[PDB]
Amino acid sequence: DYVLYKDATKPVEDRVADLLGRMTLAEKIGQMTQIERLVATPDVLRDNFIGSLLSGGGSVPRKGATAKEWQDMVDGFQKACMSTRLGIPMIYGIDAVHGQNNVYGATIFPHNVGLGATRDPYLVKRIGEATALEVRATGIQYAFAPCIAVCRDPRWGRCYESYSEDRRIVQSMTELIPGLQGDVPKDFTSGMPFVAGKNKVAACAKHFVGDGGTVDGINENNTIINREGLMNIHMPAYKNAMDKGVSTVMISYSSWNGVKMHANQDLVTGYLKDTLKFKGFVISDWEGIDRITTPAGSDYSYSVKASILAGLDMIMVPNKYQQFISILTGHVNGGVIPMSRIDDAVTRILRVKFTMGLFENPYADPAMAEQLGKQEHRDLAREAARKSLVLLKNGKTSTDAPLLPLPKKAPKILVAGSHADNLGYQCGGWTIEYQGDTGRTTVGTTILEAVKAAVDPSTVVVFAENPDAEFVKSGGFSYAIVAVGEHPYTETKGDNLNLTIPEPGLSTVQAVCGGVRCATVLISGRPVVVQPLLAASDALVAAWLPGSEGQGVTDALFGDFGFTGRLPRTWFKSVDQLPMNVGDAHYDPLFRLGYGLTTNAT
Numbered sequence: 001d002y003v004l005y006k007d008a009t010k011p012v013e014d015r016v017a018d019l020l021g022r023m024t025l026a027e028k029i030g031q032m033t034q035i036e037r038l039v040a041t042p043d044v045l046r047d048n049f050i051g052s053l054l055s056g057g058g059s060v061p062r063k064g065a066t067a068k069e070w071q072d073m074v075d076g077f078q079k080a081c082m083s084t085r086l087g088i089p090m091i092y093g094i095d096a097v098h099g100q101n102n103v104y105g106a107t108i109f110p111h112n113v114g115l116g117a118t119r120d121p122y123l124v125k126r127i128g129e130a131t132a133l134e135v136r137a138t139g140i141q142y143a144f145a146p147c148i149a150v151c152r153d154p155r156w157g158r159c160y161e162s163y164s165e166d167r168r169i170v171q172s173m174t175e176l177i178p179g180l181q182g183d184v185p186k187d188f189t190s191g192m193p194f195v196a197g198k199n200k201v202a203a204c205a206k207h208f209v210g211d212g213g214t215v216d217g218i219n220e221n222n223t224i225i226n227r228e229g230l231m232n233i234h235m236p237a238y239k240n241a242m243d244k245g246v247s248t249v250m251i252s253y254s255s256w257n258g259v260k261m262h263a264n265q266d267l268v269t270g271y272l273k274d275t276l277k278f279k280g281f282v283i284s285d286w287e288g289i290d291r292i293t294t295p296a297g298s299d300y301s302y303s304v305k306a307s308i309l310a311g312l313d314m315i316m317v318p319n320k321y322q323q324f325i326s327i328l329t330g331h332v333n334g335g336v337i338p339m340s341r342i343d344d345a346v347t348r349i350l351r352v353k354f355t356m357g358l359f360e361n362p363y364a365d366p367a368m369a370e371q372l373g374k375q376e377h378r379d380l381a382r383e384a385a386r387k388s389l390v391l392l393k394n395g396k397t398s399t400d401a402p403l404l405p406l407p408k409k410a411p412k413i414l415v416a417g418s419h420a421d422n423l424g425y426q427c428g429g430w431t432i433e434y435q436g437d438t439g440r441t442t443v444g445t446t447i448l449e450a451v452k453a454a455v456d457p458s459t460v461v462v463f464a465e466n467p468d469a470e471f472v473k474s475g476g477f478s479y480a481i482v483a484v485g486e487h488p489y490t491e492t493k494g495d496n497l498n499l500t501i502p503e504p505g506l507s508t509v510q511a512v513c514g515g516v517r518c519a520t521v522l523i524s525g526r527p528v529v530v531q532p533l534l535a536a537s538d539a540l541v542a543a544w545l546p547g548s549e550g551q552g553v554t555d556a557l558f559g560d561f562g563f564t565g566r567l568p569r570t571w572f573k574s575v576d577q578l579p580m581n582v583g584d585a586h587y588d589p590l591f592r593l594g595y596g597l598t599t600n601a602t
């Protein structure tokens with residue numbers, strides 16, 4: 001009664017081949033199908049031999065769910081999968097792209113653009129490490145991260161998910177990968193997948209390729225650039241990912257010179273697989289195959305043929321699994337898609353599952369639950385937040401006293417602005433909900449809370465969200481901290497041609513700073529029109545989307561640490577200049593990539 005694939009002491013490739021040789025067409029196509037937990041039931045998982053599940057943004061068992069509730073959900077799905085004839089465990093994926101961010105009480109790290117400002121790849125690794133633990137705390141084995149897009153136009157609604165417009169910074173930050181997955185061994189072959197074990201997670205380098213180079217930063221659009229620019233800008237970090245053993249790669253919605261990435265056999269098979277020698281699995285984006293056609297979904301039969309022939313291994317359906325499975329089955333049965341293509345896709349999927357130890361530990365570890373939101377992880381996020389801040393101005397004239405760092409002791413201070421006490425706003429998109437949200441959406445410390453935690457007990461802290469000029473002038477304030485900026489957004493909702501922050505933002509800064517010396521904290525996913533905020537402010541800090549740990553902000557405002565962050569993107573003078581990147585011809589920045597003022601700790 002020995003079955004070689006169930007034997008944990010055998011080599012991964014022997015286990016993969018042994019299992020593959022036993023599988024029916026239905027079992028094989030099943031591996032290739034990922035479905036939303038929203039459509040999953042025990043019978044659906046068993047009857048369709050489903051290979052993977054995901055939670056999309058905001059797909060949660062319930063609002064407020066505990067780590068254990070997540071574990072019990074995942075384990076209930078796994079129980080169903082393990083009960084099939086072959087008992088192939090599912091892999092569960094989720095967008096843990098700045099911590100385990102769909103989950104209440106999870107540590108929310110700064111978004112990527114802020115992490116780019118740190119120039120600290122070891123920090124990002126340690127964030128990968130903490131994120132894996134917080135993901136495994138919820139029973140989940142697979143994170144759709146890192147986004148290694150090189151955003152070339154900040155009008156893109158996902159620019160905050162890019163570490164930098166400079167491919168070299170992005171390349172340096174692929175250290176997230178061995179943080180999430182573990183360090184590959186001495187003699188590792190570039191392109192092979194790797195995950196250390198049950199305390200780590202499979203990663204996903206996304207979105208292949210040129211997602212950050214789209215015309216006018218239009219999300220999911222066309223990236224018009226020759227092979228040499230594709231390979232010089234958008235590709236390099238994928239090779240770094242191969243060298244670090246990234247387990248999966250997700251394909252972009254975007255097109256390259258008019259060809260849909262989800263149908264690009266030359267790039268997916270010819271380049272990623274045959275040239276970079278990637279041996280993990282390639283996954284679609286969410287209804288990515290549907291979007292091959294215009295309109296989307298209008299020829300699903302073609303979407304399945306084109307994508308699987310292009311070299312995609314797993315399809316994030318994620319809802320219409322019966323139609324996907326029926327169509328791919330028919331294509332195989334009719335000789336349109338050879339068995340060799342199915343066998344390759346399934347080889348890769350199983351290779352990742354076996355390598356990461358999923359057949360040995362298919363179920364959650366309840367002892368890991370307490371990793372969620374752990375104070376050591378918050379301290380890390382707080383460090384990252386502080387390191388991400390870029391000080392853009394610290395004095396209206398070169399002769400003024402520097403405003404920062406501020407003194408912790410003063411009779412009375414003002415904290416103001418729409419973003420001074422709003423956790424959701426300081427977290428941005430991909431936090432609790434897909435699009436993010438407003439207000440106290442999870443566990444954290446707002447800027448106002450951090451000020452109160454930082455200041456001398458004699459210091460009276462006044463909060464006013466949008467005070468008028470008279471209120472400020474009459475307040476007897478020593479100084480003000482005013483926080484304003486962008487509202488949370490994701491993907492196309494963030495595509496923005498004007499890049500001016502919503503009002504009241506500017507008007508609040510003008511009223512505050514017109515009455516008292518002010519430090520303006522700008523919360524944004526990207527450079528936004530900033531000359532008017534600058535002209536009003538004594539000091540101004542670009543804080544990006546710093547996450548749950550607002551004490552990172554006050555750590556630098558009050559001089560516990562000096563400002564060290566440096567712009568990871570060009571700050572434009574005007575949106576009419578865009579696209580404009582470091583190294584262009586017409587390069588006329590307000591602040592060049594690399595700019596950032598410093599302070600010393602007090």
Ligand SMILES: OC[C@H]1O[C@@H](S[C@H]2[C@H](O)[C@@H](O)[C@H](O)O[C@@H]2CO)[C@H](O)[C@@H](O)[C@@H]1O
Binds near residue numbers: 285491
């Ligand atoms: O979340 C998986 C995958 O998604 C796309 S966006 C996805 C949201 O998760 C889902 O809740 C919403 O209704 O649909 C959107 C896309 O239309 C994303 O490009 C990718 O990075 C992410 O890993």
Ligand SMILES: *[C@@H]1O[C@H](CO)[C@@H](O)[C@H](O)[C@H]1NC(C)=O
Binds near residue numbers: 221255258
């Ligand atoms: C780019 O966006 C326009 C709408 O702005 C749309 O008509 C077109 O199909 C898009 N192209 C691609 C390749 O996504």
